[PDB]
């Protein structure tokens, strides 16, 4: 009641203001905690009433941060789980609730071992004396690299995503493990791409076409990799996979303040300039070769089957 | 021949009606009169008149879907085919941006449905229609879109490479979809898809679910000769196609093969 | 206007004669009557009738080549332009193999000259002619090639992507060549070059030396509007073109820029 609405309002304002928490896996765990806390302390007669309640509570989290699709498609996965439980019990008050409890607990068991399974199958994609190029900062790709370097000796080009230099942290965290890393800017991507053998990047949101949004400037890396014919490896979990089509809804990119691009101390020329800072970008699925999830490697021509196995077509509007 | 007479009576009474829908309605009308399955088999062996891919495709899909519940099976099958086009428009018209330049092939009711659903959602856009002249049907498309109160320009047939750099997306309705994601359509689809791929424009295919044929042409000759007839029919590679818009959802070209494997021809 | 009357008398007396040749002959006829250079400047300011690129290109090249030896200069210049076409045929017809499938655009006397020089050297080949219809001129090309006793097939305008996989080389005569190696031609050249590049077929351009214009279009709009007029004129990128066949030899598309730098417009 009071604590429920208080924590819901706190989560909504946390998604409205900034990125809280920092890890997307931690935000997914808090999303499952919010959904189990909202189903354990409420009352319903029909399962469709709970479906409408979860939809009404998810619309606010979607309108809080539209660029954060993880809470929205996790709400949609929990909606499909509750729909499948109502379907297997339809062909109902405490038994359905206990089934929802054990299913969301099983979803946390599956979600805690996602990066572990990605690091487990990391060995079948990296050979010795290999030139790797990445962009931005992501825990999945650096875990991939620090597990692949346990038995193999290779090189990683840590290209920074530079609206704000976050890839320096990835370069330092890899060089502490000894991956023989090299730091450059966004302007040397195609200049170094003639020596890059594979492209291993992360993403923010996998779309329904197999398209993906990620840290900005990676569409340029995908174009240079398609020019030099190198395969792209997308180490991405199964909760960044969303049924939002690219041109269907607006607010695709996330815009931040232009201070990180052009500072406030520039002068009188700030009045007559328009400085936009997209921290994301669009990558079409034909520029992608392989997706790496915790269940195995999948093609961009196979994301629709995971969409059918994880999502329901009457929930794509939410 | 009463089957061809009933087909002409169902197809000529409404000029905005498809041919395969009337063919499946003729099959259901023979199923109304076992003897009904024998009469349906006789008229589907006797319906060799239309050279369209969608007619034979819907006939094959109704021949599988039929195999006392056959009449109600065809009834809700025709209900799904009749209610398909609204789902086509509602799933497809959300991609057209404001102020976009539309490129459109020859006349089909499906692209007219998605353009009237697009102007129903308060969108402003210009449409370039290729004339597509073995016969003047693109002029009929431009006339039917001028009655829709949208800015349309009659484009010469050899100018699809001329206007490709200004048309930001290419939306073309197809009349037949093979398994891999390629399409069988009117002869000017291949050059438009190649010019859109050379200019990196997204080539969209807007077709229904009954046009899923189990064929696999490699070349322009590997399409069957009974559908060709100065050819009327080309073939577009599935690598030249961005998306498809069916009633099962907005699909990548690799999803048609999944649906045809799950359907088993 | 006696200049336009002399131009019509020189162009209409021989239907197999080019327009820029008659324009330079009209300039020389004004140079026959200083006052001759003033009359030539007056008629070249008054010759704004033809919208072809080759006419204005030959006018500009004669205006540079003129600058008492002007009459003999124009005399041997017209001698070189008249003897150009035999060198065109003799340098170009050696590439056509036996049993090849020729793809040809709309009517021009240059491709007819190289095909009659090819059948003069005892070669057997089939020619596919695109109809190219803002007006029926590809039918006139097929009629003039049927009188040549060669197997010709009238091809639909939207089938250049249909027949590209069986036509092993694509030889197209152009009406205007810009500096980088691209060509200005009839509107269906761009789609044919793009379909030939997607099918890896060698796209050959057969044009003379007086069609070297100093222009540089980037897009389909960057060609001048006075040459466009439903457009009649496209632009082909020089990367889509394999070779050119001029009277100075069989040239790569980077050689036209060398000739125009050595000529200085």
Same domain membership, residue B221 and residue B146: yes
**Nearest chain B residue to C191, by CA:** B161
Same domain membership, residue B96 and residue B44: no
CB-count exposure of residue A168 (10 Å: 0-12, 13-18, 19+): middle
Alpha carbon distance B161, C188 (integer Å): 8
- The CATH number given to whatever domain includes residue B96 is 3.40.50.10470
Q: For C124, how many CA atoms within 13 A lie in the half-sphere containing its CB?
A: 1
**Nearest chain C residue to B153, by CA:** C230
Same domain membership, residue B132 and residue B13: no
Same domain membership, residue C122 and residue C177: yes
Alpha carbon distance A120, B152 (integer Å): 57
Same domain membership, residue B113 and residue B60: no
Q: Among C88, C105, C124, where does a domain finish?
A: C88
Same domain membership, residue C21 and residue C104: no
Residues of B with CB under 8 A from a CB of A: 94-95, 97, 243, 249-252, 254-255, 258
| Chain B residues whose beta carbon lies within 8 Å of the beta carbon of residue C134 | 156, 158
Same domain membership, residue C233 and residue C153: yes
Q: Quick check: B220 and C163 CB within 8 A? A: yes
* Number of domains chain C contains: 2
Q: Which of A247, A316, A317 to mutate to test the interface with B (most CBs of B within 10 A)?
A: A247
Q: Virtual CA dihedral for B233, B239, B240, B245, nearest 10 degrees?
A: 80
C-alpha angle A69/A317/A295, rounded to 5°? Answer: 50
Residues of B (179-198) whose Cβ lies below 8 Å from C? 186-188, 190-191, 194-195, 197-198
- Closest Cβ opposite residue B95 in set A248, A302, A305: A248
What approach was used to elucidate this structure? cryo-EM
Resolution (A): 2.8
Same domain membership, residue C184 and residue C252: yes
B-C Cβ pairs (cutoff 8 Å, strict) = 85
Contact C59, C19 (CB under 8 A): no
Q: Among B35, B63, B88, where does a domain finish?
A: B88
Same domain membership, residue C57 and residue C93: no
Is chain C adjacent to chain A, meaning 3+ CB pairs within 8 angstroms? no
Alpha carbon distance C244, C60 (integer Å): 21
DSSP chain B: -HHHHHHHHHHHS-TTS-HHHHHHHHHHHHHH--HHHHHHHHHHHS-TT---HHHHHHHHHHHHHH---HHHHHHHHHHHHHSHHHHHHHHHTTSPPTT-EEEE-S--HHHHHHHHHHHHT----EEEEE--TTSS-HHHHHHHHHTTT--EEEE-GGGTTTSTTT--EEEE--SEE-TTS-EEEETTHHHHHHHHHHTT--EEE---STTB-----SSSSSS-HHHH---SEEEE-GGG--EEEETTEEE-TTHHHHHHHHHT-
| Chain C residues whose beta carbon lies within 8 Å of the beta carbon of residue B165 | 219-220
Mark A283-318 as b/e (b = at least 16 C-beta within 10 Å): bbbebbbbbbbbeeebebbbbbebbeebbeeebbeb
Q: Which of C162, C184, C197, C198 to mutate to test the interface with B (most CBs of B within 10 A)?
A: C162
Contact C129, C141 (CB under 8 A): yes
Q: Quick check: A247 and B94 CB within 8 A? A: yes
DSSP, res C147:
T
Domain span at residue B205 reads 89-263
């Amino acid at each position: 009641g009071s604590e429920l609405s208080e924590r819901i309002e706190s989560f909504v304002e946390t998604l409205k203001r900034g990125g809280g928490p920092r890890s997307s896996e931690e935000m997914a765990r808090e999303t499952l905690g919010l959904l189990r806390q909202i189903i354990t302390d409420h009352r319903w007669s029909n399962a469709g009433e709970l479906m409408e309640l979860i939809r009404r509570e998810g619309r606010r989290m979607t309108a809080a941060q539209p660029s954060e699709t993880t809470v929205g498609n996790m709400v949609r996965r929990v909606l499909k789980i509750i729909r499948e439980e109502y379907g297997r019990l339809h062909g109902h008050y405490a038994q359905l609730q206990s089934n929802i409890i054990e299913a969301i607990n099983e979803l946390l068991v599956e979600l805690e071992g996602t990066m572990e399974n990605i690091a487990a199958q990391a060995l079948e994609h990296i050979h010795s004396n290999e030139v790797i190029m990445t962009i931005g900062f992501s825990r999945t790709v650096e875990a991939f690299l620090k597990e692949a370097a346990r038995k193999r000796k290779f090189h990683v080009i840590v290209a920074e995503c530079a609206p704000f230099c976050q890839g320096h942290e990835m370069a330092v965290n890899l060089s502490k493990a000894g991956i023989e890393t090299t730091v450059m800017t966004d302007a040397a991507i195609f200049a170094v791409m003639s020596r890059v053998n594979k492209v291993i990047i992360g993403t923010k949101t996998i779309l329904a076409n197999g398209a993906l949004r990620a840290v900005t400037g990676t569409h340029t890396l995908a174009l240079a990799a398609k020019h030099h014919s190198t395969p792209l490896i997308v180490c991405a979990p199964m909760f960044k996979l969303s049924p939002q089509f690219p041109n269907e809804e607006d607010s695709f990119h996330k815009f931040v303040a232009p201070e990180e691009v052009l500072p406030f101390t520039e002068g009188d020329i700030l009045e007559k300039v328009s400085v936009h800072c997209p921290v994301f970008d669009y990558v079409p699925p034909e520029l992608i070769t392989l997706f790496i999830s915790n269940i195995g490697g999948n093609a961009p021509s196979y994301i629709y089957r995971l969409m059918s196995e994880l999502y329901h077509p009457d929930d794509h509007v939410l | 021949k009463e089957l061809i007479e009933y087909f002409k009576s169902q197809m000529k009474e409404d000029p905005d009606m498809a041919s395969a829908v009337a063919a499946i309605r003729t099959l259901l009308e023979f199923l109304k009169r076992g003897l009904r399955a024998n009469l349906t088999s006789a008229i589907e062996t006797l319906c060799g008149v239309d050279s369209s891919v969608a007619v034979s495709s819907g006939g094959e899909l109704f021949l599988r879907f039929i195999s006392k519940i056959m009449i109600e099976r065809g009834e809700l099958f025709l209900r799904r085919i009749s209610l398909s086009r609204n789902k086509i428009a509602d799933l497809c018209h959300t991609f057209i941006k404001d102020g976009a330049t539309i490129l459109t092939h020859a006349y089909s009711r499906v692209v007219l449905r998605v353009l009237e659903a697009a102007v129903a959602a308060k969108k402003r856009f210009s449409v370039y229609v290729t004339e597509s002249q073995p016969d003047l049907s693109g002029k009929k498309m431009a006339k039917a879109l001028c009655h829709l109160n949208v800015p349309v320009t009659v484009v010469l047939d050899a100018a699809v490479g001329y206007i490709m750099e200004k048309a930001d997306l290419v939306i073309v309705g197809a009349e037949g979809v093979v398994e891999n994601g390629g399409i069988i359509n009117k002869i000017g689809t291949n050059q438009m898809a190649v010019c859109a791929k050379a200019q990196n424009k997204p080539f969209y295919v807007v077709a229904e679910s009954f046009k899923f044929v189990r064929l696999f042409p490699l070349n322009q000759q590997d399409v069957p000769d009974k559908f060709k007839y100065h050819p009327w029919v080309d073939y577009t590679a599935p690598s030249l196609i961005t998306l498809l818009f069916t009633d099962l959802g907005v699909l990548t070209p690799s999803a048609v093969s999944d649906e045809l494997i799950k359907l088993y021809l």
